[PDB]
Design a protein around this nucleic acid. Structure first.
Ligand code: CA
Ligand code: CA
Ligand code: CA
Ligand code: CA
Lengths: 153, 154
DNA sequence: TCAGACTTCTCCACAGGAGTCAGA
DNA sequence: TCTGACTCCTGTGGAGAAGTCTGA
């Protein structure tokens, strides 16, 4: 639970609203109770010639990782606890992605009670649909409906 | 001269380093001294669905305009005095585009003089080249060498 | 003549997902 | 059982130019 400098957070929020992404996903999984698991991700993308900027970001946030894919690189953070802490601090400064952040925070807090009632799980999956609805989603496959079809069994 | 709030400049700098562009151009221009007209632009691009976000910038910066192009909108500020004023205050907070901003400010200032000798003008054109070089430039046509071509000829 | 309002074009550099896998 | 690290892909939503056309 580290506390970030407020000027760092204001600049970072602007950069995230622009080149970043707050992502919620339902991923198929045979070994889990409801055959699906959730994955939340904070993401900043940038051409690989500017990877250094993403490197500095790892050091500043103090967690996460950079990966390369083609001519582009990404800072990523999916680890639940640090993510919940980070977004909680960034959230008030976000303008375009404030809702996505809030939905992700809500999802994380409900994670525990979501792995019990199939009905509660679906509810949380609906929060996921809402994040995707807010994003510029274009290649999405697995939704809360997908989960339903599967639960009906 | 409008003064801007600091927390505003901090967030905007981040957003500009992300979705923004600081652009220097040499444009043709028959009805002109050296047949090339200089043009500077600060710009922010966004899907037209989020045009409101750009509309607000017009109000917060206090000048500039929003226009549409396909599925996308842009905030633009080209007017030289306010551009100078705005970039001077933003520049301190920029991370990826700080050098482009300083070059634009440098060009704006050395402008009146750059319209004296074909050399002073041409030297400022090389400042334009640097901006483009620092940008992810892909569809550029007119450079300082395009200028030297029209000057070393006449 | 001229800066400044306004339009068009092109090539990515993002965003926003889909997955596989290995060690908890 | 399950999560978090890591890779790969699509389809734009950007960026970074290129231009035309007034008015004073
Ligand atoms: Ca963006
Ligand atoms: Ca959407
Ligand atoms: Ca960018
Ligand atoms: Ca470059």
């Amino acid at each position: 639970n580290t506390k970030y400098n407020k000027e760092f957070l204001l600049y970072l929020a602007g950069f995230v609203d622009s080149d970043g992404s707050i992502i919620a996903q339902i991923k198929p999984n045979q070994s889990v109770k409801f055959k699906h698991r959730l994955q939340l991700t904070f993401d900043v993308t940038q051409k690989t010639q500017r990877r250094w900027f993403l490197d500095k970001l790892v050091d500043e946030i103090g967690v996460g990782y950079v990966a390369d894919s083609g001519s582009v690189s990404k800072y990523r953070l999916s680890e639940i606890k640090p993510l919940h802490n980070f977004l909680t601090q960034l959230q008030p400064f976000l303008k375009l992605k404030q809702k996505q952040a809030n939905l992700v925070l809500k999802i994380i807090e409900q994670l525990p009670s979501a792995k019990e009632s199939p009905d509660k799980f679906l509810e949380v999956c609906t929060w996921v649909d809402q994040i995707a609805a807010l994003n510029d989603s274009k290649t999405r496959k697995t939704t809360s409906e997908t989960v339903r079809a599967v639960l009906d069994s």
